[PDB]
Amino acid sequence: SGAIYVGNYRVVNRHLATHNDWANLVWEDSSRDLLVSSTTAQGCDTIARCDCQTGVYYCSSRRKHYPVSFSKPSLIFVEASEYYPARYQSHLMLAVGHSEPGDCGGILRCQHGVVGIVSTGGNGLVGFADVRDLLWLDE
Numbered sequence: 001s002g003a004i005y006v007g008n009y010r011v012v013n014r015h016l017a018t019h020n021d022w023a024n025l026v027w028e029d030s031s032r033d034l035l036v037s038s039t040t041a042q043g044c045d046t047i048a049r050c051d052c053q054t055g056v057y058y059c060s061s062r063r064k065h066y067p068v069s070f071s072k073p074s075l076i077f078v079e080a081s082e083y084y085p086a087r088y089q090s091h092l093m094l095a096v097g098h099s100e101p102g103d104c105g106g107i108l109r110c111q112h113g114v115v116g117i118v119s120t121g122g123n124g125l126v127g128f129a130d131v132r133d134l135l136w137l138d139e
C-alpha cells in the first residue's frame with residue numbers, strides 16, 4: 001500500500017484504489033496501473049521532472065529503503081493477476097531489487113523528488129509506474 005500526495009491530488013495503484021478514490025476520480029489508466037483522486041487537504045510531495053535512472057525506493061516487506069538503477073519508462077509485458085489479464089503495462093520502469101504484492105505503492109525518489117510508485121515485481125525484479133510525465137499534477 002501507499003500513495004503520492006501532491007496539491008489537491010492523491011496518486012495510487014489503480015488496482016488498490018478505494019470507493020472514495022473512485023467517487024472523487026480525476027484520471028485513471030488501467031494500462032499504467034494508475035488512478036488519481038481529489039483531496040480536500042493539501043499535499044506536499046514534490047514530483048521530479050527529469051530523466052534520472054537512479055533513486056531510492058521503499059520496500060514495506062523489508063521495512064527498508066533500497067538504492068536502485070532503473071530502466072526508462074516503457075511497455076513491459078506483465079503476467080495475468082486477479083486485477084488484470086495478461087497485458088503490456090506502459091510507463092513501467094524495472095530495477096533489480098526485492099518486492100512482494102503488499103509492496104505496491106512504495107515511493108521511488110531521486111534527488112529531484114518523487115519519480116513513481118511500486119506497481120509490479122517478481123524474480124528479483126521490481127517495477128515502478130512512472131509519474132514524471134504527469135505535468136498536470138502541479139497545475
Ligand SMILES: CSc1nccnc1CC(=O)N1CCC[C@H](C(N)=O)C1
Nearest residue numbers: 033081099100101103119120121122
Ligand atoms: C510489487 S508487486 C509483486 N511483487 C512480487 C511478486 N508479485 C507481485 C505482484 C504483481 O507484480 N502484480 C500484482 C498486482 C498487479 C500488478 C500490475 N501492475 O499489474 C502485478
Ligand SMILES: [Zn+2]
Nearest residue numbers: 050052110112
Ligand atoms: Zn531525477
